[PDB]
């Protein structure tokens, strides 16, 4: 039978496929997901228009084995943001796109930019445009009341103004020189550009 | 021949010669999440934890007191050592709602330069890609 | 009028050495 | 019957890890945590995930009104010795309650201040006009629906509840130690 | 089974492809992304109508190696 | 033959002869992000930082005090030198919420002209494209 | 997998072709 | 009535030479 429709559809199993452990190939030429890249913001960031950001690594980035410097300090990272903010948001999504090593190594990391403690997006000072959103309505109401008072002393436009200018998205301002992190979203492989050699002793 | 080169590289990494160790570390705060040993070799800082201790989260503290993430690798025979890739005057250790501050009392601003591109002074990192 | 609470700041009173003994990884 | 219970972590195993990143749900993003303890096999004899292993996850979608917990999916764990397994499992609290939760910012002022201010200025103007001898609804209708924001501090304890069977047969093997 | 629809769709993995490092060809004849070109605005800009702007570089722009003046 | 020309170009770049160095640099502000050495050769300004120091962001300060971006290249054996492509009386160094001002106390407005199109007086840049 | 729809579409790269001087 | 805050301006009191020693890159 096919009855018991509600109870029979709440009893449909959820079968999740198992996983098998693998192993990373070369952990000396590897930067894995979830590595934190600490860089200093060069450009001042204002989210009025879509644009491109730039930061420089403040520290050397080692491999997952922790033995080879894969990204040197002073490496330049280029990213971009778009879309602006919505009401109630205080952080913008920044995607870092490419990093250039001072020795000429280039890798396309397309990773999310975060704050100094890894919170998602870049955040700074927020301009909510209070006056541009409410000044028309406030001014219209006050002039209406003043005119009514003057007319009485002889012995809705405010809603229209508010409806048009109430929805102005906020603007984020982030100062130059601020510390940011790049959280690596994919595995970065440096096997094709570096190799190791032992130093002759003394 | 490449096996010979790899063996030489591993031997150079293991030999670990000419290293100075700084042991001047103080701590204040929640001592229940404290390491049993902390030191640095001039490039990395090592915190050793006991077998029965949970491994906490370690944070980098700047001059103004702001915390930031620092990369870490877990080393040791029993994964009891957290190695952070920086030498810093002050560290923050957090596990849940407990915090502990670690102070480097012999901080050397100069450090030792990394001329080779590796964690060891006995291995060069060389540019294979050419181009 | 309400902001995100900060994580606990450790007290700076009971400041003591971390290393009671030399680590054996230092080979000492 | 399960095949090899020494190279196995089954569904419903609790992985206790410490949150590294500070979590703010304004934008979609990626989280990161480290295992605080060794994870043994179902037989309880082999350490399959070492302590200090790094777990990477992500969240998205934000919160809705009345919600105080965000859904986090942990995607991959990396062992300090180089073992990688793709566990796509739900993140929970310290006692296994679904989702990560922290302090919630409900944006009371951003939702009601326009209406309150409009009403108060309207009443003040009416009072001043009388002393000679709806805009508030429009403001509220536009800004009433602002989703809350969750803040979770760094260093907080979390669990990963394993949603599938994890098999380690291809990366480990056991050997007896010669006595003495 | 295909049940658990909401929980099963929040557990769909996000698999991001890895990247491989390459190398720039000639860093003496190259200006890479993210280089800042400092120029002085010639025209006065008023955004009433769409239009064209013009500026002049105030400084020499070097290569990524920092050895050849490219602009 | 082209390998010979390339070797000659590299030798000319490395030889670095007939260079005058200005070392009159002062600093005020947050000394924890300060360089250990600053100088210029008449064309570029070099700030050297220690091994344990984070590399900060460096800004160009004009007469009115407005900051602007200046291109930089990272040089040195251990990437410890930031070379900015300008000589300026005043510089601004920022890292996070710390700022440090660098003052060139021997600023030469004239400088030395760049007649060759390269950073060295021993290499011409020549117009290959013809057209 | 094709999940993580919002985060995966904010991480789509923007690849701009280079230019050659004439 | 509210404007974007400026970055910190360094104090102009503790003005001291940058170069305590001649750099070795100058070969001196």
Helix axes A130-152, D135-143, angle to 10 degrees: 170
D126: left (phi over 0), alpha (psi -120 to 50) or beta: alpha
What determination technique applies here?
Answer: cryo-EM
Residue E57 forms contact with A (CB below 8 Å): no
Beta strands in chain B (DSSP E): 25-29, 37-40, 45-48, 57-61, 67-68, 72-75, 81-84, 90-95, 98-104, 123-127
Distance CA D113, CA D143 (A): 9
Q: Are the CB atoms for F20 and F124 separated by under 8 Å? A: no
Upper half-sphere CA count for residue F67 (Cβ side, 13 Å): 21
Q: Which residue of E has its CA nearest to B129?
A: E23
The E-side interface with F (CB below 8 A) comprises 35-36, 38, 59-62, 64-69
Q: Which helix (H) or strand (E) holds B10?
A: helix B2-15
Query: What's the gap in Å between the CA of A125 and the closest CA on chain H?
Result: 7
Cβ within 8 Å of residue F44, ≥6 positions away: E66, F83, F84, F85, F86, F87, F119
- Neighbouring subunits of G (3+ Cβ pairs under 8 A): A, D, E, F
Cβ within 8 Å of residue D59, ≥6 positions away: D23, D25, D28, D29, D31, D70, D71, D72, D73, D100
Please give the full DSSP string across chain D, using - where no structure is assigned.
--S-TTSEE-TTPEEEEEE-S-EETTS-EEEEEEESS-EE-TTS-SEEE-TT-EEEEEE-S---TT--EE-EEEEEEE-TTSEEE---EEEE-TT--BSEE-EEE--HHHHHHHHHHHHHHHHHHHHHHHTT--HHHHHHHHHS----EEEE-TT-EEEEE--S-EE-TTT----PPPP-
Q: Which residue of G has its CA nearest to F127?
A: G22
Q: Are the CB atoms for A79 and A110 separated by under 8 Å? A: no
Residue E15 forms contact with G (CB below 8 Å): yes
Burial class (CB in 10 A: 0-12, 13-18, 19+), D21: buried
Q: How many CB pairs under 8 A join C and D?
A: 12
Residue A108 forms contact with G (CB below 8 Å): yes
Domains of chain A, by residue range, sit at 23-131+170-202
Q: Which residue of F has its CA nearest to G20?
A: F129
Residues of chain A neighbouring D56 (CB-CB closer than 8 A): 33-34
Cβ within 8 Å of residue D113, ≥6 positions away: none
Name the token pair of A53. 């950001």
User: A37: closest CA among A173, A179, A175?
Assistant: A179
Residue G14 forms contact with E (CB below 8 Å): no
> Strand, helix or coil at E70?
coil
Beta bridge pairs of residue E56? E40
Beta bridge pairs of residue F128? none
Distance CA A39, CA A181 (A): 6
DSSP letter, residue F46:
E
Helix axes A130-152, D108-130, angle to 10 degrees: 20
The pairing of strands A188-189 and A30-31 is: antiparallel
Do F119 and E68 make contact, defined as CB atoms within 8 angstroms? yes
Chain Cα centroid distance, residue E62: 18
Q: Which helix (H) or strand (E) holds E7?
A: helix E5-10
């Amino acid at each position: 039978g096919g009855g018991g429709g509600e109870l029979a559809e709440k009893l449909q199993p959820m079968r999740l496929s198992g996983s098998s452990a693998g192993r990373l190939g070369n952990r000396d030429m590897l930067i894995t997901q979830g590595t934190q890249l600490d860089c200093v913001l060069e450009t001042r960031l204002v989210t009025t228009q879509p644009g491109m950001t730039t930061c420089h690594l403040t520290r050397d980035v080692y491999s997952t084995s922790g033995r080879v410097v894969l990204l040197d300090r002073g490496s330049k990272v280029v990213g971009f943001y778009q879309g602006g903010l919505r009401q109630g948001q205080a952080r913008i999504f920044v995607q870092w796109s490419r990093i250039e090593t001072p020795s000429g190594v280039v890798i396309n990391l397309d990773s999310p930019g975060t704050g100094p403690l890894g919170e998602a997006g870049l955040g700074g000072w927020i301009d909510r445009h209070f006056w541009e959103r409410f000044g028309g309505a406030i001014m219209i109401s006050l002039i209406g009341d003043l005119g009514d008072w003057a007319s009485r002393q002889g012995s809705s436009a405010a809603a229209e103004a508010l409806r048009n200018s109430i929805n102005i998205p906020p603007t984020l301002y982030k100062n130059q020189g601020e510390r940011v992190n790049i959280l690596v979203a994919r595995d970065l492989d440096f096997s094709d550009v570096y190799s190791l050699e032992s130093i002759p002793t003394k | 021949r490449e096996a010979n080169a790899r063996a030489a590289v591993e031997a150079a990494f293991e030999q670990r010669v000419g290293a100075y160790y700084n042991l001047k570390y103080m701590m204040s705060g929640d001592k229940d999440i404290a390491p049993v040993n902390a030191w640095d070799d001039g490039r990395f800082t090592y915190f050793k934890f006991s077998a029965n201790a949970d491994l906490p989260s370690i944070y980098f503290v700047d001059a103004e007191g702001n915390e930031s993430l620092v990369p870490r690798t877990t080393v040791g025979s029993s994964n009891n050592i957290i190695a952070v890739h920086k030498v810093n005057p002050k560290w923050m250790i957090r596990l849940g709602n407990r915090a502990l501050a670690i102070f480097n009392e012999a901080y050397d601003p100069n450090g030792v330069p990394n001329d080779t591109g590796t964690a060891s002074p006995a291995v060069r990192r060389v540019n294979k890609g050419g181009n | 009028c309400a902001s995100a609470p900060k994580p606990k700041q450790p007290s700076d009173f009971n400041r003591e050495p971390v290393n009671k003994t030399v680590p054996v990884e230092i080979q000492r």
